[PDB]
Amino acid sequence: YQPTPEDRFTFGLWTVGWQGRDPFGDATRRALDPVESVRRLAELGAHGVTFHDDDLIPFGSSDSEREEHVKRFRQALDDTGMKVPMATTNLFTHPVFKDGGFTANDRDVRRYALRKTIRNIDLAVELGAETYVAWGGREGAESGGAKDVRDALDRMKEAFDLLGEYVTSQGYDIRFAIEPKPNEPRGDILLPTVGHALAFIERLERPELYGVNPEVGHEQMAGLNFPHGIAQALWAGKLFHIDLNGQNGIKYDQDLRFGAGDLRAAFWLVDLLESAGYSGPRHFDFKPPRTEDFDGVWASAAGCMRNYLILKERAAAFRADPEVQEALRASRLDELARPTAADGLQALLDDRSAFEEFDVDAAAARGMAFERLDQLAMDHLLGA
Amino acid sequence: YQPTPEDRFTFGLWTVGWQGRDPFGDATRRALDPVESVRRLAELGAHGVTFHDDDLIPFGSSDSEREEHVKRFRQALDDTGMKVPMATTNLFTHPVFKDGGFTANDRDVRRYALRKTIRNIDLAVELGAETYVAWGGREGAESGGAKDVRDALDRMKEAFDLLGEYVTSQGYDIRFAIEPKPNEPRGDILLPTVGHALAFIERLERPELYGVNPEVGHEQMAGLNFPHGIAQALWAGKLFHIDLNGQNGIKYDQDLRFGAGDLRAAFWLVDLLESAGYSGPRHFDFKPPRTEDFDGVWASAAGCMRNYLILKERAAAFRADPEVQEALRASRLDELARPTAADGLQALLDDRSAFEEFDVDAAAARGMAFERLDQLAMDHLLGA
Amino acid sequence: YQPTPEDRFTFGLWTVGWQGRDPFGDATRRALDPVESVRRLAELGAHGVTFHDDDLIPFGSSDSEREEHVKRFRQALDDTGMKVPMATTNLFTHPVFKDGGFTANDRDVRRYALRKTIRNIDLAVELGAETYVAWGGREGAESGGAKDVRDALDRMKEAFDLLGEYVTSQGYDIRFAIEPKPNEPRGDILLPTVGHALAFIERLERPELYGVNPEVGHEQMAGLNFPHGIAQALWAGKLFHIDLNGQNGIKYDQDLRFGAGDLRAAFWLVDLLESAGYSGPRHFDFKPPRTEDFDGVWASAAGCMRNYLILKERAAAFRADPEVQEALRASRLDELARPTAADGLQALLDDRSAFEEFDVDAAAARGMAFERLDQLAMDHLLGA
Amino acid sequence: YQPTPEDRFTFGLWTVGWQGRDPFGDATRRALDPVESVRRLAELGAHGVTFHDDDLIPFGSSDSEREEHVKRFRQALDDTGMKVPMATTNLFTHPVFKDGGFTANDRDVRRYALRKTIRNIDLAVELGAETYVAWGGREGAESGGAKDVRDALDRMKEAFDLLGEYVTSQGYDIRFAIEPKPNEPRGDILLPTVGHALAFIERLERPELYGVNPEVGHEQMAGLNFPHGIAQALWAGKLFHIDLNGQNGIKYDQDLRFGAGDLRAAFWLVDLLESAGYSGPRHFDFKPPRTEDFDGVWASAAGCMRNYLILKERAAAFRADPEVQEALRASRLDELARPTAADGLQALLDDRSAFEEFDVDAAAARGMAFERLDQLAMDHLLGA
Ligand SMILES: [Mg+2]
Ligand SMILES: [Mg+2]
Ligand SMILES: [Mg+2]
Ligand SMILES: [Mg+2]
């Protein structure tokens, strides 16, 4: 279960580089130079790294400082063969964004958020990123009067529409992926789930340029089934990136390493990504716990990739098992895939076997055999 | 705070008629004749009643029994002046639907679900209903292998598309409202939130025929902000019906009377419905607690309407208060409503006040004044 | 991973016998004769069965009917070698208990609840049960004025004290195990967690006669860590019974088969029970999903036992691995087990290495190595 | 609804002094001198202030710096008439406590935690505090192998026992109040609820010296009913302090001003505190949202006190209303307060009206009238 860059595992700079500051605690680790993280991740068998503008270039940097930071980073990428598939903007840390970036009540802040983002899209393209993530983590409210959500959605559409116009105007080959989260750090966040984000995207001027970036833990913070949400995204053709991590239920955003948290959901996720042939990178957005030193940091990142690979093997063995293929037919998963009424409406209305002569009790007496199927899945996961 | 039929308050038959059976308990009340509920609700000042096919006509009824049940019901409606604005199908109670109706793995069940629904659409139109609700409460799974969600969404689209073709083919003036719920009775339910349902609707062959029917408690069972979700539905133009009730947090679906549960969220909901000029009926989907006798049943229903009316008065007084109007400007709610960049992209890119000369620290130092605003809202709610 | 009666696996009659009625659905299975469940469970390798009074003897039964039901049941137990380690009373199903049994506001109901329970304690002793469970599932409220919780706790203490006096007065060798649940079917249930129940027990007249019966799913419905709660119960010496099942997070009580739900928590539970040498039976309180026929019922029950046995093997291999024993020392689990100050208070106050000369920064720089340890645990669970 | 120091409202220094740093954000406010907070709070009508050692004296301070900080603080208290009823130790912020204070796996850290606490108990007594709070916010784990909870509870008992021995040995008049929290910042925290903390306390060498300090939001983060928990604490005689704030459901710890969050639960809490005659201070542990400037900070604190006072008036009017007193009798709240069997066990066993002649159906048919009662409570809360 050794990763190679062929597995397309990617990590944010802000993941392994998290210093360990939390709402109740100071940093437990020193800051990492992005150069050293590139090198360390490459040695573990990662394929690439991603970044927020402010992870790579300190906020307030001069043109000349900005150029140096990027130069050094590009040299580490060239020294290792690491790629940058994705970038994103920090619209959440600085106090100016305390009420939002794109949906800040202050219009001047909204304009500044757009300009900060556009500056970073140019950088992303320069580094070869083809996906640009937006996580509106400050877009929302703690109280009901502070934000009119209809006006905010108008502002959010206008921002995303302006970005689309920009990338179109530059001829850039980049698409956007909107990252939903239900809460934290705001009391409630706008576009709280994959579904709200998919629906929002269908109202944009150029919907083909935008997809979702679902994160395991964010959906699980609302008690939702992350595999189900990913399936809806895939069904829609809008899964443009994915963030992998662990989460133990409905609480603060834990960002555990992928595989920790809800292990069976992590199995069904890998099963789905692999069976759908998802072609994007397997991106980890996690935090090594503040209890850890740097050795524990690199062990944590390695564990993300290892767990993916074990689950990939177990899911592949599950689908390939003749006994599972038989159970899947016993549970009528093959019938779920057939059209309900390819014969058409009128034929359905004229079919007495669909109503007048349908034996509801015999249909009702047929067991689904789902427990046998699920026990086979558990035996495969556990290698029993 | 006395309701009149002008207030357009409606109730499901299955609400006041709930006998009190729960997963751990037998019925505590006898069955109500829909005639008696019509009369009792009219006396309390309700405007109308709604129904599942099986609330009005016992499952398995002959043509002649079906005709009698409907006759008697129509006579109560004519005796009282009560309307039927909405109907829906029961695709959840009978054992045949144990794995779904429209997304049952068994294709024969899917065809029967469609036919049962189409039969009830004809009845609804006959009674004057202009909205038809669909709550796929059995559509989902307890385990990951039992349902391929992409195949299920294909089946769900095909069902809703067939229904749309039917109503179009009959020239009926009725629209559909899809009711999301995240779980219960399935482990996870397909289209779990307002957002997932809005996004689904945009993939149907005739999206204009379908909206959402959000229910207070269903969104709150995922820890989501129900006013925020309603605002997104309104923004989309897809709020085709609403279900009002109470819920105390993330647990089983309580169906408390509207006003119980999350009282401040109920205030911000009424504020939003009234300020948006929502024109649909104020429909209550609640259960009088099994502790209650019939006197408590009618008190519970009366309390739904009373609480709405009190909250309507308090929200209206909040928005009309000059001191609140001033606080709203202090918090820049007027600025949230202005376009971010009506000047256009190029002008935003050339505006140095948006970036090079933007004073981020002075912007950041400006307080939002949201606590003053929220305390005014609390003072109004409480009449302090 | 084949169970034998030596493994001491037990099942409630109401588990495999659940007909599949839920709040939104009719029964999907016919009723099982307790005789047939005894036989079927014995064939699967169970050790015993447990019961509510009303699972074994229909409510309202004559003396002569009651005698026949018990006779037949005793014959199945004698035919199979199955034991009855535990019984309990149904104080929740019948409408009379709609506001409680022991804490019903109506005093006459409280007296009847006591008498119904005492009648069943005599039966339990007759069948050889040494543990008597009490689950006050109706003890609680949907609204704040309906129950004064201090008066209710007085009533609950008086009931448990009366029961203690009874068993003492009869010389019976039986102890009680109070089963906490945070909600469902009441809005909030009294003694909602293991902790509330442990604390309550310390106020009873004879605390040695009472322990807790924690259930996996009940603690998880409050988002609590079930292994942690069990460790507190063990630390207190009050783990008198345990109920094993699965639950996917904070939602209605799912009662999935043990092993489904939170798989890693199920691993750490088995690890703890086995390492503490818990000597009680491994009791399953689960419901085969209503999707299943009887073949699926027996597969579900078999899966409970199989999953326990797989997890027992994986936890045993984890603790026995020299590399895990080394990681446990690297993480200072051996130091957690040593007394903080066996030297005494005065020596701690006079120890400059504890304060004036304590190097806080060198202590703070030491990593805990918890991610390495946890990845070893994950590798063992998965057999990687 | 103007507070006076007679109302005994208290605030932590760390409340109004919170700079606004969160897991995703930098500080939005400058640091407050504790002198200025004392003055500002006194002007708003607060009675007192509380503190962590590190809120008043910067970590690492010399003896001479420590003396100056305390001097200045004492001068503000003398200038205003503000009291210090309570203090507590910071065992969570500094990196040295990343795995705990009293239950850190490293024994040297455990000894340092004790000494840091003992130093602050001496200060507290010097300032006149009679309650000392302990919030073990780092005591817990993100993973199952990192903490053996039985060993940790042994360490926690030993620490609390040592503290008890210290205060006894000094003749100090101070008691301890243990503050439960279910999670955050640890994945799961030891003693997660009021119940776990009450039960723990009964195992200490001198249980009379320890009580609980329940916080509204902490219980609500587990979805528990905070009034119910407070009633159990009162019933036990262990409510030694209380922390008041707001929380909207199961999510990260919001620390909203008291009255925001779950408004009806805040009503039933005040009802209970006032009706039980709780004599401790009404302590607010909240954070003014980071959106606010200092004007919003003082408005937020004022709003805590105002909301308490409004709710106190509404609860008092509810209990004093003859129509509510009648409803309370209709719902048999008077009967809940009577002993179930003051006649004794033998008389209960010989009473045929408790079993053989008990009419279960007539008992079952009696409605509880709880909805009428609850609507009266809602009308009072809203002043309708
Ligand atoms: Mg992310
Ligand atoms: Mg509904
Ligand atoms: Mg149980
Ligand atoms: Mg606190």
Short mmCIF file of C-alpha atoms in Angstrom, two decimals, chain B residues 1 28 223 248 250-251 257 259-264 289 291-293 295-296 299-300 303 306-307 310-311 314 364-372 374-375 378-379 381-384, chain D residues 1 28 223 248 250-251 257 259-264 289 291-293 295-296 299-300 303 306-307 310-311 314 364-372 374-375 378-379 381-384:
data_model
loop_
_atom_site.label_atom_id
_atom_site.label_comp_id
_atom_site.label_asym_id
_atom_site.label_seq_id
_atom_site.Cartn_x
_atom_site.Cartn_y
_atom_site.Cartn_z
CA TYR B 1 -54.52 36.76 17.49
CA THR B 28 -53.54 6.72 22.40
CA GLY B 223 -28.83 21.21 11.98
CA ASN B 248 -35.85 20.74 19.05
CA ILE B 250 -31.04 17.05 15.74
CA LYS B 251 -33.01 14.02 16.79
CA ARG B 257 -46.79 22.55 16.93
CA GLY B 259 -43.80 27.97 17.52
CA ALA B 260 -42.54 25.26 19.82
CA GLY B 261 -39.03 24.10 19.14
CA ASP B 262 -36.74 26.81 17.86
CA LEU B 263 -38.68 29.94 18.63
CA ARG B 264 -36.19 32.53 17.30
CA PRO B 289 -48.37 14.75 21.22
CA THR B 291 -50.11 12.52 25.74
CA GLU B 292 -53.15 14.52 24.60
CA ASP B 293 -56.82 13.68 24.32
CA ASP B 295 -59.42 18.52 23.56
CA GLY B 296 -55.60 18.76 23.48
CA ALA B 299 -55.74 23.18 21.38
CA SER B 300 -52.56 22.13 19.64
CA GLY B 303 -51.76 27.06 18.96
CA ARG B 306 -51.94 31.69 17.22
CA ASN B 307 -48.19 31.47 17.30
CA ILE B 310 -48.13 36.60 17.27
CA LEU B 311 -44.85 36.22 15.37
CA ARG B 314 -43.72 41.02 16.32
CA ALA B 364 -11.40 45.89 9.36
CA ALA B 365 -11.79 48.23 12.35
CA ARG B 366 -15.42 49.09 11.44
CA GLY B 367 -17.72 47.16 13.69
CA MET B 368 -20.79 45.51 12.15
CA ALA B 369 -23.17 46.52 15.03
CA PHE B 370 -24.95 43.16 14.67
CA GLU B 371 -25.43 42.64 18.46
CA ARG B 372 -27.35 45.90 18.82
CA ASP B 374 -30.13 41.43 17.27
CA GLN B 375 -31.04 42.73 20.71
CA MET B 378 -35.15 40.01 20.67
CA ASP B 379 -36.88 43.00 22.39
CA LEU B 381 -40.07 39.23 19.74
CA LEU B 382 -40.55 39.39 23.51
CA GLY B 383 -42.57 42.63 23.45
CA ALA B 384 -40.10 44.20 25.88
CA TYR D 1 -35.03 45.63 32.86
CA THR D 28 -10.51 41.61 15.26
CA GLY D 223 -28.26 17.83 22.21
CA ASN D 248 -27.78 27.03 18.40
CA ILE D 250 -25.07 20.68 17.97
CA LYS D 251 -22.07 22.35 16.41
CA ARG D 257 -24.95 36.06 24.56
CA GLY D 259 -30.94 34.64 25.46
CA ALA D 260 -29.74 34.06 21.93
CA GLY D 261 -29.68 30.46 20.84
CA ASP D 262 -32.43 28.36 22.35
CA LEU D 263 -34.79 30.96 23.71
CA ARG D 264 -37.48 28.64 25.14
CA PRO D 289 -18.95 37.96 18.06
CA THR D 291 -17.88 41.08 13.88
CA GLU D 292 -18.24 43.61 16.70
CA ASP D 293 -16.16 46.57 17.78
CA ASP D 295 -19.29 49.38 21.39
CA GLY D 296 -20.77 46.02 20.31
CA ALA D 299 -23.93 46.01 24.05
CA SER D 300 -23.51 42.26 24.01
CA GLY D 303 -27.91 42.13 26.47
CA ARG D 306 -31.35 42.34 30.01
CA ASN D 307 -32.46 39.03 28.62
CA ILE D 310 -36.99 39.87 30.88
CA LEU D 311 -37.14 36.08 31.22
CA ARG D 314 -42.08 36.35 32.16
CA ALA D 364 -55.07 5.67 29.50
CA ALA D 365 -57.99 7.74 28.16
CA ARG D 366 -57.20 10.69 30.49
CA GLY D 367 -55.47 13.37 28.52
CA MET D 368 -52.46 15.10 30.09
CA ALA D 369 -53.48 18.65 28.90
CA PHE D 370 -49.80 19.46 28.31
CA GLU D 371 -50.43 21.46 25.07
CA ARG D 372 -52.77 23.88 26.83
CA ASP D 374 -47.37 24.86 27.08
CA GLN D 375 -49.34 27.41 25.07
CA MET D 378 -45.53 30.53 25.26
CA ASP D 379 -48.14 33.33 25.70
CA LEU D 381 -42.87 34.32 27.31
CA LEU D 382 -44.07 36.42 24.39
CA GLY D 383 -46.23 38.74 26.52
CA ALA D 384 -49.25 37.91 24.36
#
